Design a protein around this nucleic acid. Structure first.
Lengths: 71, 258, 175
RNA sequence: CCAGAGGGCGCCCGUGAUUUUUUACUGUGACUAAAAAAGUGUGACCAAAGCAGUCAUUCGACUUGAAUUAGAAAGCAUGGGAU
RNA sequence: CAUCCAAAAUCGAGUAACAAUUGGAGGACAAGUCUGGUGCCAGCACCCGCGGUAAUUCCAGCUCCAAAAGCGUAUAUUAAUGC
RNA sequence: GAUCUGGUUGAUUCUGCCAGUAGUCAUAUGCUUGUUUCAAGGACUUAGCCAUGCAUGCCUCAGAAUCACUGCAUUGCAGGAAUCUGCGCAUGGCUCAUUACAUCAGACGUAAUCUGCCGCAAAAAUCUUGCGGUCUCCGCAACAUUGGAUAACUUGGCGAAACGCCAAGCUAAUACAUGAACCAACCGGAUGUUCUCUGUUCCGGCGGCAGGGCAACCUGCUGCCAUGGGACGUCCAGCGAAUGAAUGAAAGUAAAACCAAUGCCUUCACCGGCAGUAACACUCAGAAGUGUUGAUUCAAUUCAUUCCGUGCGAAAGCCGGGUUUUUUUAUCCGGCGUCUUUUGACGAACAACUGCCCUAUCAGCCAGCGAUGGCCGUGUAGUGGACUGCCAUGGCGUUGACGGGAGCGGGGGAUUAGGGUUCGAUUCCGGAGAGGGAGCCUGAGAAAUAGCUACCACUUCUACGGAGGGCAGCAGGCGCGCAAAUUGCCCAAUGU
């Protein structure tokens, strides 16, 4: 995913984008999701940067992932 | 908690009908799982035909006349998985259950020597109080473990009256394998290359006599021996070869003449 | 009926969920234990494995440990001083993990004597060692600042540690 | 139990890209309960069905049989280099 | 259900009364220019239509046609629909 | 079997609806009926209301027998009721009312957790008993002759009724409560003003005394120690649990001298050099220098403190069989049963990568009363705004939020050249519910309703003082509606 907004304290916000297929039409379509992930103070990635993240146990109400590696 | 199993939620490998009751026996927790095994009353009745109905079965079993792994088993239901040995003195039969081509359970017949021999894989290796090493398999723990210590996924040779452990065999290239699970089981092969993918399922690549090579995962692999002359145990009439659907069909026709 | 779920809460979208289910014993809170100073009382309950746990009430006695000397010895919690969760807890003299409290000091003072044939050991051990001056003044006087590191509502005991340079200065400057 | 010397392979770790590259797509494989559907075999007197059963003048032989396939999107491995 | 009506020894179809029905016959749509009754009345008719004294459609006889141990009627839904 | 026909005009060619036509486990409603195989059946409206009866109990060779009970024998043996005890009733059955980051399917995770029965495998802790004396505490022995209660039963009874109840007297255990030395091991800690190898050993230390002594110190006197090891004695040590330290391999330069040791050569020599060389004070010359994973604050190990009922017996248990010769042995052998620890699969709980009807005449939705995140805590089996306190201002949305309407989800069914449309209450799988709501106990597992408590609605019996009920289990009623079966027989089969 990529980065959308640097707000909050240690909690960044990811956007993703990906396609979808409807069998009847035989054409594609666009959709997004979003996720609320944790960012260590070790990194400081900027909006529009790519990132790679990882699965985790619940660290907050929404937050279920944590950053591994920035690009 | 569930205490009932039904005929349409039970495996195809037991070969029970849709009809003739709506219930099947649920085997207990034991040496093996619920989704692969063959329960006792299913063996006796539906295969060997020394019981015609339920009452018959328990009228054998409960008197201690049936012994898997040298221990007599009173219970009506109790699972018996891959690589066990069933010995019923009264007949003079002995079985070593196994898989066979078409993915389906099979029954070999073995003599004296191999009625005391078994094989066991290694699932995990862990450490217990006093720095005593431990292994874990399908059937059971058992303790320490040299024959010479080593490592997971490897295969032992276990004797049942007392431990005399012949050696063991490891997971390494050029060895031999029989398979479980995966809709690829009941076959036999060599071991070419093993791919390792960290954090994820580990994929193997195999071979068999006269080519027609294939692949599976690595927790569907169970070692047998170094070579196919080096095997400790006997195998069915088929040597773990699939042959084509057309070949099979044709042959069945031609020989049906009688 | 105290529950732990996200069912009673709102969505992230500011909406509101509708139930179709009652509540379970799988989700289950029980009312806080407040563990004070006084003679040992215990209030045992049972959990979902058939394993008891011990809700503590009123604990005056403790067990506390140096780091760096690698020992632990007893003592008696005297007064509560600082707590960072609330000032509520201070005034009531209740005890929670990472609370800052005061101890008897005596068993530590004792033991540090020993830090015949023994007469050689008292040189060899005292060599290659110093004790902090921060720690010193306290230890002398007969009271110390220590920190409880146990959770004393679910074990019914307090255990702790003891504060050397870094931690210690961060606490003192509050007081 | 032919030694010294460089070569070569199999495991393990560490350091290195002036910016290392990727997906959609498609080929071949992995993984995935029945019932139902598709389908092979079999004269239940045909049939709708069902997994049975057929021989042998004997104290059993078929090393009996119950094949095989399909299952949107997404996930997983490994090839292709056109759009 | 299956078997049999003696293995010495055990019943029974002729109007084969042991006797098929439910909707139709102007067109759509397989099948009457037949004979009585009614006369814009009574009724039929999904649609187009029929009935005012020679009614191929109504009410009944006789004959013929479709399906058959089944055949009409309403309602919903799919196909007919590239509406 | 990739098809059509009738109806707008005086007649014609189009556009476009209406009507015809074939299926449908898709229901109703008339007419009609001779054999046989097979099969759904009060789901639609009312998850509305229910009379009566049944629907979950269990004993073997193997936990407790003085029925005042039965047979045989005449002081014993075999049956042995309903009672204590152990296990199960949280499964199976029945129903779709609520319900769209909800459920659910495919694919993954728990290193964030619990887990009875079942499989396999372990366990070296504890001053007890008898005898004799007595001073409380000893001497002498060794296979533990443990302890206190309570039902059925009897005696008095109470009550209109009640799956309602009371006083007294009896006796059991694999119930409940105690409690086991020597036999019986390996390994480590902390120590004595213990004595004996000894200091080879002084400069300093520890002091011990007197003079001045204000015990600051100066002086004189004096003992011991300044590398150490052998014996003897004392306190502690198990499993599991809490807290704090330590361990939980390494893998990126090359030859000499320096003193402190100290090893080996070597010598009469504790003379002065490096050839040999896993470790290391004997007894043990290899009795762990080496855990798994992609990853660990994990497994396991070592040390210091602790554990008080809320943990730990060889059931202080039961049954056989061979012996023995006295029936009748510490004679041997076997089968059961149970406490504690560890980890598999039978399960449970929690998390979410991807996907699904209609509606914009629903466009802004979320923080006083947690909305998004941060910090220390609390709670729970555990993770978490799950919750408290404190601090920030975020979160989501025209790539349809929020709100409303319809609806249990899926495997699948009907129709069909193909693309599709439509249905799925209902046999299998998952979820939820038991008149409406809430709260709770027991248990490994339940917010259980043929369990409990309270309220609301409905309702039964009564001697009016009280005591009860819950068919969306199987039959059968009542009401409702266009509409749906016997108040049967049986555990033979298939299971629990």
């Amino acid at each position: 995913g990529v980065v959308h907004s640097t707000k909050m304290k240690r909690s960044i916000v990811i956007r993703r984008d990906y396609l979808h297929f409807i069998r009847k039409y035989q054409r594609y379509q666009k959709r997004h999701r979003s996720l609320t992930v944790h960012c260590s103070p070790c990194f400081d990635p900027k909006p529009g940067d790519e990132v790679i993240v990882g699965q985790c146990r619940p660290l907050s109400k929404t937050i279920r992932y944590n950053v591994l590696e920035v690009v | 908690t569930k205490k009932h199993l039904k005929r349409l939620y039970a495996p195809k490998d037991w070969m029970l009908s849709k009809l003739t009751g709506v219930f099947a026996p649920r085997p207990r927790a034991g040496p093996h799982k619920l989704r692969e095994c063959m329960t006792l009353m299913i063996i006796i009745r539906n295969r060997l035909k020394y019981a015609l109905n339920a009452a018959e079965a328990q009228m054998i079993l409960r008197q201690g006349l049936v012994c898997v792994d040298g221990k007599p088993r009173k219970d009506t239901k109790y699972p018996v998985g891959f690589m066990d040995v069933v010995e019923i003195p009264r007949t003079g039969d002995r079985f070593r259950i196994l898989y066979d081509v078409k993915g389906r359970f099979a029954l070999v017949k073995v003599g004296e020597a191999e009625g005391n021999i078994k094989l066991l894989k290694v699932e995990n290796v862990y450490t217990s109080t006093g720095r005593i090493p431990v292994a874990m398999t399908h059937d059971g723990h058992r303790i320490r473990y040299p024959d010479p210590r080593t490592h997971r996924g490897d295969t032992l040779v276990y004797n049942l009256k007392e431990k005399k452990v012949v050696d063991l065999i490891k997971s390494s290239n050029g060895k031999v394998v029989m398979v479980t699970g995966g809709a690829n089981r009941g076959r036999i092969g060599e071991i070419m290359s093993i791919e390792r993918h960290p954090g994820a399922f580990d994929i193997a690549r195999l071979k068999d006599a006269a080519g027609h090579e294939f692949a599976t995962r690595a927790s569907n692999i169970f070692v047998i021996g170094k070579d196919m002359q080096s095997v400790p145990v006997t195998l069915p009439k088929q040597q773990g070869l699939r042959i084509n659907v057309i070949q099979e069909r044709e042959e069945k026709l031609i020989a049906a003449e009688a | 009926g105290i529950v732990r779920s996200r069912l009673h809460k709102r969505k992230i979208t500011g909406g509101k969920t509708k139930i179709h289910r009652k509540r379970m014993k799988a989700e289950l809170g029980r009312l806080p234990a407040h563990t004070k100073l006084g003679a040992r009382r215990v209030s045992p309950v049972r959990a979902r494995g058939g394993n008891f746990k011990l809700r503590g009430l009123r604990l005056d006695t403790g067990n506390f440990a140096w780091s760096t000397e690698a020992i632990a010895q007893r003592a008696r919690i005297l007064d509560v001083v600082y707590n960072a969760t609330s000032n509520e807890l201070v005034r009531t003299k209740t005890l929670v993990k990472n609370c800052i409290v005061v101890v008897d000091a005596a068993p530590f003072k004792l033991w540090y004597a020993k830090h015949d044939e023994l007469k050689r050991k008292w040189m060899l051990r005292r060599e290659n060692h110093k004790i902090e001056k921060a720690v010193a003044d306290q230890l002398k006087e007969g009271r110390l600042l220590a920190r409880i590191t146990s959770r004393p509502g679910q074990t019914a005991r307090a255990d702790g540690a003891l504060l050397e340079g870094a931690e210690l200065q961060f606490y003192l400057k509050k007081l």
